[PDB]
Symmetry: C3
Subunit: 162 residues, 3 copies
C-alpha cells in the first residue's frame, strides 16, 4: 500500500469528463479541469494537459499522467508550507500519506486551517485529532472520501483500505 493506491481507492477512476460534488468538470482520479460551465472549455483544458484531441475521453494511463502530477503537486505544497512542513516532518510514512491525501482533496491552504488537528497530530495525539477531524465540514460534505483518511490518522495502518 501507498499514497497512489490510497487515493486510487478514495477517489476512484473515471475515464470520461464528469461533474464533481460542486458541478466542476473533472476526469481520471479526481483531476479538476475547469470551474467553467462550458464542456468545450473542459475539453479544451483536457486536450492541453494530455496532448491530443480526446473529446472528453482518456485512457487509464493518461489518467495516471494527471495523477502523478497531482500527487507531486500536493507533496510539493506541503514541503513549502510553514504550517504543514513541521507536521509532515513529525509523521510516520503511513500518516504522511493521509496528510497528502487531504491536501490532494482540499489543497494546502484548506488543510492548514485545521489548527487544532494539526497540533494534535504533531503531538502524537491520535484520537483527539480523529475526533476533531470528524467534526469538520470536510467530513460532512464528503464522509466517505474522508472516513478512511481519519481512521488512518487514528491507527497508523492501511486497514481501512484493505
Amino acid at each position: 500500500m501507498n499514497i497512489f493506491e490510497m487515493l486510487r481507492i478514495d477517489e476512484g477512476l473515471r475515464l470520461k469528463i464528469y461533474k464533481d460534488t460542486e458541478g466542476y468538470y473533472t476526469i481520471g482520479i479526481g483531476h479538476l479541469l475547469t470551474k467553467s460551465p462550458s464542456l468545450n472549455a473542459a475539453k479544451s483544458e483536457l486536450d492541453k494537459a494530455i496532448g491530443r484531441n480526446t473529446n472528453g475521453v482518456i485512457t487509464k494511463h493518461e489518467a495516471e499522467h494527471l495523477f502523478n502530477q497531482d500527487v507531486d503537486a500536493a507533496v510539493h505544497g506541503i514541503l513549502h508550507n510553514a504550517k504543514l512542513k513541521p507536521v509532515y516532518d513529525s509523521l510516520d510514512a503511513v500518516r504522511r500519506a493521509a496528510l497528502i491525501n487531504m491536501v490532494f482533496q482540499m489543497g494546502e491552504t484548506g488543510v492548514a486551517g485545521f489548527t487544532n488537528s494539526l497540533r494534535m497530530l504533531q503531538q502524537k495525539r491520535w484520537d483527539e485529532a480523529a475526533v476533531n477531524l470528524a467534526k469538520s465540514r470536510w467530513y460532512n460534505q464528503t464522509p466517505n472520501r474522508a472516513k478512511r483518511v481519519i481512521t488512518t490518522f487514528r491507527t497508523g495502518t492501511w486497514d481501512a483500505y484493505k
Copy 2:
C-alpha cells in the same frame, strides 16, 4: 497468459506504418489507420491518435496505447451485441479471450455471422465448433492468425501460445 499477450503473439508488433493483408495502412498491433491509398492520410490519422508528429514511426508504448483502446473496443462490441453476449456469458475465461480475439480481428458484425459455431460454443460442443471454424474464409485468408484461436476454442488452454 491473457488476451493482450494472446493478441501480441497473433498480431505481432510493427513500429512503422505498413500495408496489411488488403493494402490498408496499419501500425503497432494490427491497428488500422485508414483505408485511404494516401500515406500522408495514414500519417495524418496516426498523428491525431497518438498526439504528436510521428512521421509514421511510433514507440512500443504508443503501440500499447492504441492496443488497449482496440481491445476495450472489441470487448465493448461484444457486451452490447445481442448475438455475442449470450455466447460470451457462457464461456470460460480462456475461450472468452478467443472470442475477443476474433472480434479484434474481424469486428463484432463479422463474428456474429458464424451462426453455427456460435451455437456450438454456447452448447459446449468444442470439436464441432473447431471443425466449422476451419471451414471459414477467415481461416482460408489467414490460416496462421487463426490456427491458434481455433485450437484454443477446442482445448480451453493456452497451449498454442506457449
Copy 3:
C-alpha cells in the same frame, strides 16, 4: 541490471530543461534538445518530441519516452557501423552495455575513433583497453560519467553500479 539502469545511474534524471557540460539545452536522461542559445527553441523542440505544451517541464514517464528512443538509436548506430559491429559482436552482454553507454554519450562516430581500445576489446585485452580509455579526453572532460564505464570494460560485472 541492464543498459537502462546503467545509463539511469550514469546520466541521472532532470525533469526541467537545463544546460549541459557545453551549455546545450538538455532534459530527462541526458537528452539533447538543441544547440541553439534560445530557451524558446529548446521548449519548441521539446514540445514536438513529447507532443504537448510542456513549457520546459516533463514527467518521469515522458523522460523515459525520450530515453527508450535514445537507447535504441545508440544500438542502431552500432549495428550499422563497420567499425563498431565487429566489436559489439565479440563482446559479452555486460560489456555490450558499456559500448552502448559510450555511443549514447558520444555518438557512434566519436566512439569509433578509439582505434586502439576497440582493437583491445575485440581481443579480450581488458586491462589494456581500460588503461587506454583512461588516457582519453572523454575521461578528462567527464571522469565521473566515464569512471564506471571503464571499470565495467575491465571487470565485466555491474559492481561499479551496485
